[PDB]
A paper describes a structure:
Fluorescent proteins have facilitated major breakthroughs in modern molecular cell biology. They are widely used for studying biological events, such as cellular trafficking and endocytosis, and have contributed to the development of innovations such as multiphoton microscopy, genetically-encoded sensors, and super-resolution microscopy. mKate, a derivative of eqFP578 from Entacmaea quadricolor, is a bright, monomeric, far-red fluorescent protein with excitation and emission peaks at 588 nm and 635 nm, respectively. Structural characterization of mKate under different conditions revealed the pH-dependent trans-cis isomerization of its chromophore, a discovery that further aided the development of mKate variants with enhanced optical properties. Using a structure-informed approach, we introduced a minimal set of two mutations in the chromophore environment of mKate. The first mutation, S158A, has been shown to destabilize the trans conformation of the chromophore, whereas the second mutation, S143C, was intended to impact the cis conformation.
Similar to the parent protein mKate, GmKate barely fluoresces at low pH (pH 2.0–4.0). The crystal structure of the dim state (pH 4.0, determined at 2.0 Å resolution) revealed equal occupancy of the trans- and cis-conformations, suggesting that the apparent pKa of cis-trans isomerization is close to 4.0. The loss of fluorescence may be attributed to the non-planar nature of the trans-conformation. For GmKate, pKaPT was determined to be 9.5±0.4, by fitting the 598 nm-absorbance pH titration profile with a first-order Hill equation. pKaTC was roughly estimated to be close to 4.0 based on the crystallographic data at pH 4.0. In the crystal structures of the double-mutant, both cis and trans conformation are present to varying degrees, suggesting that while these two residues in mKate are involved in stabilizing the cis and trans state, they are not required for the isomerization.
Residue numbers in the entry: 4 to 62, 66 to 228
Amino acid sequence: LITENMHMKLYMEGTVNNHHFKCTSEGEGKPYEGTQTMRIKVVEGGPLPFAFDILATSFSKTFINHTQGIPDFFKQSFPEGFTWERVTTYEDGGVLTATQDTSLQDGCLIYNVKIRGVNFPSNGPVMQKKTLGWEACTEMLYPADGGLEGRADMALKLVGGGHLICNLKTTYRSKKPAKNLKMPGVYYVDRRLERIKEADKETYVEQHEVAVARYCDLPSKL
């Protein structure tokens, strides 16, 4: 069901600090190679009065290269699909909750996302639009009651050269019955999420991700 080349379509809506917005996107990737591109339009509420960077991780788990024979919870979940829900907490107080549904319809991946961001500081780099994209990061995934949890800290680059850190807590849930899933143990996903293009003080954005799943590649004593 998951071919070597796949397309995706996405619908996103929500609010950040009482600012309403809506996006749509389409893209393609190579799910077994862990690469993908999404071309995103802000269609309502734009240009956004906050940094688009805080929405970046809300635009795709089917496109992770699961190496070393790690069971692939995401690719296994089709045709039924899967969901994820995340709370991202910024060190200066912003909190952004994202809820997502992933389905497969007529050979295309379909994403539906709802966003609720609150308490971003009015004078901070997010609301002031003083961000410059994300550093690479490693997410740890681990089984927890029939689904997976993920944890990562990400660093947001800032105008002037500093960083603002946030913490991501995600739960990934399959729509496939447990009986039909081979669960992985604990593992890690290295990611590089990059902005390739922006047009119109950020109403059009192209993003690229490469994502590779691995175990810890250090020798063990146990």
